[PDB]
Amino acid sequence: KLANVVILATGGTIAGAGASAANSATYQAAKLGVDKLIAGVPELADIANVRGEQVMQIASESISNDDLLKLGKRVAELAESKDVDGIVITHGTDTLEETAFFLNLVEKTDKPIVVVGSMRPGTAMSADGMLNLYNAVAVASDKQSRGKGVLVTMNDEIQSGRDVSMAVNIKTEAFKSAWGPMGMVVEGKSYWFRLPAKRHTVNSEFDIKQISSLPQVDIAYGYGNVTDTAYKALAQNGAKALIHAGTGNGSVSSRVVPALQELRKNGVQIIRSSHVNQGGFVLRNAEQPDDKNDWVVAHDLNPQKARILAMVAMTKTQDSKELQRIFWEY
Template sequence: MLFRQTARSAAALFGFLFCLAFAAQAQTASVKLPNVTILATGGTIAGTGATSTTTVGYTAATVGVQALIQAVPEMTKIANVSGEQVFQIASENMGNEHWLTLAKRVNTLLAQSNVDGIVITHGTDTLEETAYFLNLVVKSRKPVVLVGSMRPSTAMSADGPANLYNAVLLAGAPDAVGRGVLVVLNDQINGARDVTKTNTTSLDTFKTPELGMLGYIVGGKPFFYRASARKHTVETEFDVMNLSALPQVEIAYAHANVGPVAIEALVASGAKGLVHAGVGDGSLPAKVRPALSSARKKGVLIVRSSRVGQGIVARNGEANDDELDFVAGDNLSPQKARILLMLALTRTTNTRDIQRMFYTY
């Protein structure tokens, strides 16, 4: 009798454990991994050096996207990853034509139901500019994450693999939806509009100095603490899908003893817009003001920005923008003010409307 009861108890226990194991297996099988596409453009993350200690003087953009993916097999546990080689360049060579090609490909992919997010591998020199451009023209709430590295793939302590893993993790994360284009390096998440490269070689070079990062990636999970307040992606008025070129917009850098030569040359080259990276609060040196005023009278749009790197350029502060018919660049860096002015000129040449855009995006 005792034997029968023991046998029945053992059978019941075995059945219970089997059900638990089956349920766990079924739950694991039901977890659907996000589909993330990696668009590779080159840069240091795809670079190689002569030795494992070469961290400067290496050759960028030599490793293809499939090799990058194969180097981080752990990504297959967090996403269904596919890759495309869009460009293979060092990012100092990134041009308007590259941006248009990239933006169109991103929009096309994100319109597909089988793509949940996109990672773009990119050189760090102009990564912040590409990120802001995409932040203004991507027409989807799905995550778009730009990632790079400060050391080539052959370095003994290369940061690229971990950065790429985090980027894929972030691109597939529900918490990243609707936050605009993101930049992730060194376990830190920054927004495209405000992030900038702050150091020539250190790993923690990408920062948002005044406003702060959006969050961290810790323990395989993104943690967000704030969101970008300015409109982006689906909320913008810019559409590049039918554009074959962008208006020529240049930057003139102010300094002690600056003269009008650069401004006059840029205008003569056919610039439709000009960002003046002024000193202080976007001040206009006496030798420069007449050249900028003359350029505006010729139809060139002028944006007053600052070389300082932080702070707002106040409208009608260091110059009478109303009288000069200039646009104040708000707190955008000169390189990002150039991007917004380019896109603004695809919509209008009205300075009041363009000023509105600078306060909106």
């Protein structure tokens, strides 16, 4: 008897349209509704009982925290239903990785949750979205997906929503993780090679059902000749934490350190991430005296991932030692 899968559409390239078959890169996002996406893959009926809902219709670079909450709360309601076995979210690529991590942290369910997009719109020749959507539904319908946390199923892969990132522009292999794909999906079947290590979903201390509004968190970049201007301005305009997207191992210019000390003293969390994203991690107390300054390192998480975790964590704690524990467990 086939699994019951709900597709939650949010917009994106997978729902996009361009002017000609050769327009694989120049198009408008968020033009097709969920029922047209489903009807475009008649084979979905072979692998699941699918129904669709239009949660929003956006280009994902324009997503808001309120959009994350609305989507996350709808996912939770559906997960609580005995009529729902798995959930697929169709999404723009730009912030797919942010949504996927958010859901991984706040959805206290073992039911499969898959986020999926495309790099080419469906109007293009050789568009990737049809098979990606088929694969998302296959994975969301597979017993092997239960308890694995949020998954992303592009490029014939099963990627962890935690640490997959949009890493390559244009090409269909865009989404990569420093820690590899966990599996592959081919001709409807899932093949697993690794399991998650980090806390997720049912083993998370966080729950979307308790979050009413997310704390404001912003990101500032590190580079030669950088000043403290962006950090100070972002804090002045409401940032409760700043993600520092440092050079190297989360390093901080000597012209920036004093401002970050003052901001921490005034209650703003300081989280050291980096723009060195293909591998490794930011080590506590290496580039900066995090203990002395009461700062946090983002471990392996890229800046936009670190922002997501910081927002969720700060719904529970203002203790920088607890925030560091969270950045070491999730």
